[PDB]
């Protein structure tokens, strides 16, 4: 079986809302259409074990996100922001079981935390892929 | 073949020892059972190449890690905690050739770095997953 | 099919240079001969869905890195070095679909933004491994 996916976040001046699924639709491989990236979200076809890596540009503010399945957090990360000139940088990551219809996606956590950044020069990434399947009848 | 696991680390006001492995008992994915959620070790069943990632959060003190095989550095990461009120953080990663019994497991190689950390809305987290098996007779 | 590498940085004096490949020379593993530890560049030849992460240090200068294929960013990652007098980290991570002939490396894209590092005790990864194939006739 096969699943993978990998996008990155646009620009933008808009502060990131904290009440959604971040964004990443600047799609970089998805050859299974099982990433959307209208609504940010992975859907599960496939039973099985998956990883999941967010590598994230962090400026303006600090970043606190979660990676969740169907808004359950998985895992949770964080990375102070200083009052610094230019961008720091936050790496997120897990192991999860997932069965079809599942769901996975990123989101802020921490309302205010919202430093998710991207520009001509920096990038925030999601990926995530199936490492092997684990189909019943 | 198979073997994949992640886990997390538990909150403690114990400033972590650096001198055994640092635990992750709250356990994401095991399977198969090769890792072990109370000695903080991996322990190969299938020879082959394996990827292993740590995503840590960094609080009260520098963190330096080793990712290790049999108690060897397979690489070695730091984060700088400069006097910050908030967390920062750190990952690190390697690919490794294992066979069967070899362990994998994260230390604080220099032992006051010792700023791994959780909270309610923080995590440190180790993952690691069989890439393609090689068995031989 | 196969395919697998994870290589580190040497410690060196001289600060990096940005009109190249930045080397990793410290190979982990190579099974396939599939990554250049002389270039820093990794070849596919089996097409399909690569994962590629970087685990850096940073020290002395700010690091800005692409990760590249075929001269092309797949995305771009980068972390600030605020004056402190130990270092800091940056990961990076993506997916790509690769064809066999196809390149990718890390290499720094604002060419001041050089501070990767390596020492006694810290390293600068990077790995990569086909996720699943995907021959044609």
Same sequence: chains 1, 2, 3.
Avoid at 80 to 100: H, T
Avoid at 103 to 126: E, L, M, N, P, R
């Amino acid at each position: 079986a096969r699943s993978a996916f990998s996008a990155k976040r646009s620009e933008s001046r808009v502060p990131p809302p904290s009440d959604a699924p971040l964004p990443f639709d600047r799609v970089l491989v998805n050859e299974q259409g099982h990433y959307d990236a209208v609504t940010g979200k992975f859907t599960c076809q496939v039973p099985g074990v998956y990883y999941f890596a967010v590598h994230a540009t962090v400026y303006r503010a600090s970043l606190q996100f979660d990676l969740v399945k169907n808004g359950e957090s998985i895992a949770s990360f964080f990375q102070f922001f200083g009052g610094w000139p230019k961008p720091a940088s936050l790496s997120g990551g897990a192991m999860v079981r997932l069965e079809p219809e599942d769901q996975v996606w990123v989101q802020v956590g921490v309302g205010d935390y919202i430093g998710i950044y991207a520009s001509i020069k920096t990038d925030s990434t999601f990926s995530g892929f199936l490492v092997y399947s684990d189909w019943h009848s």
